[PDB]
Amino acid sequence: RGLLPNHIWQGDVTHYKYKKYKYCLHVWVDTFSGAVSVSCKKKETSCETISAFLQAISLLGKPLHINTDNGPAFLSQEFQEFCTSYHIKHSTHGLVERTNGIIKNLLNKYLLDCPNLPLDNAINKALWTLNQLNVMNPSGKTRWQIHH
Amino acid sequence: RGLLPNHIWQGDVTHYKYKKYKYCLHVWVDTFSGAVSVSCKKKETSCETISAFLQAISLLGKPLHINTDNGPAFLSQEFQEFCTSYHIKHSTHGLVERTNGIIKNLLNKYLLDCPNLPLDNAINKALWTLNQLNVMNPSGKTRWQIHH
Amino acid sequence: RGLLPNHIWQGDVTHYKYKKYKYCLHVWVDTFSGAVSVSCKKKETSCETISAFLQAISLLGKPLHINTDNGPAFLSQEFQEFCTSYHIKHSTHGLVERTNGIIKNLLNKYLLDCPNLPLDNAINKALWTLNQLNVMNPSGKTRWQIHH
Numbered sequence A, B, C: 001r002g003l004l005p006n007h008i009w010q011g012d013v014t015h016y017k018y019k020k021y022k023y024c025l026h027v028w029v030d031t032f033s034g035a036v037s038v039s040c041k042k043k044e045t046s047c048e049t050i051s052a053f054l055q056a057i058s059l060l061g062k063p064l065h066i067n068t069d070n071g072p073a074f075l076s077q078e079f080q081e082f083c084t085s086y087h088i089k090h091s092t093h094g095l096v097e098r099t100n101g102i103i104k105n106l107l108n109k110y111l112l113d114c115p116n117l118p119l120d121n122a123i124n125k126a127l128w129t130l131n132q133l134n135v136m137n138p139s140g141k142t143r144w145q146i147h148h
């Protein structure tokens, strides 16, 4: 939908069960480049939601538009007020759907290949593989290249 | 004062009291872009000062000139010798003053919004908000954009 | 040998003895820019080798060619299969030799200057000094500048 990088992002919080625990994967993907930020969180409150969002902005750049579901994360005042403070238009109107599946496929794989290493390690490996290793044909460019 | 990014930086070490403890905030701001690096340190010796400076170079790039106060951090031989080794002109001749206040305002806010999270978390959130979220009108550009 | 950044990399695993322990330094250097990634690892198995390699790609970009020795790290199926999966040509055919020496000289220095700080700290300081502080005359550019 986005015509350039950081025109329109999509965001979701999805659960990822691991070692008997359901983490909250905050996921931010750019709709033009496909570049992704992912944060693993214990909770889903406005602190973690804003913290996951800032981190995505840290890696990708500041977006103009963001689209999310009606999850409790993206309906809290704190988050809405955050977005209006820094001139980020936010609609609660799939790409994040597919992106979640890709991310989790890589997590499951990296945790299987290396069962003793932490979950943070597997998320870095998954992010780095998706953004900078996967060549998004036919352009030959990776998501990271197209974004920057 | 700087005509381009990394022409002239300013640097300061300021105290930030939190949970009964005074940390040393090493602060490096570029005088053209306004882009900032901040490191929280327990001490202010040449190890931490050089370590905070390298980190600023890690994020911003290598500067030609740096201006600091006569604090003990920027008068030690180790630091002076460091600067002369890597061709960085250093004068001990406000922007860092205002930058410290902005940084601390964000720290106080993020620690208030999320009292249970560590101080490192709040510093990342503060840095990311300042460099990449704040739009420095009238250009519409953020500090990070103008720097890179 | 590389005509551009990320055309041809060289990679090595070398030992670095510190505090009675031999770490495995995975080292990835670009043959055109001289830009370097270094990861400290306890082991040398395919998990750590791929993890160190992804991190190098994370910082530098995806390479087309990589050249390594016949070390057990770069002969494992897991690593070979990894490379063929993501379209990275890998030969087991010096720059990494000199790069290892430079890196270790900086490690020895930073550990001497600051004996109480962790080894991770010294590796960051060494990497940042090499990539972004050292001016690679006569161009005046640093390795990081030439790479990006």
Ligand SMILES: [Ca+2]
Pocket: A012, A013, A014, A069, A071
């Ligand atoms: Ca959801």
Ligand SMILES: [Ca+2]
Pocket: B012, B013, B014, B069, B071
């Ligand atoms: Ca001071």
Ligand SMILES: [Ca+2]
Pocket: C012, C013, C014, C069, C071
């Ligand atoms: Ca070797």
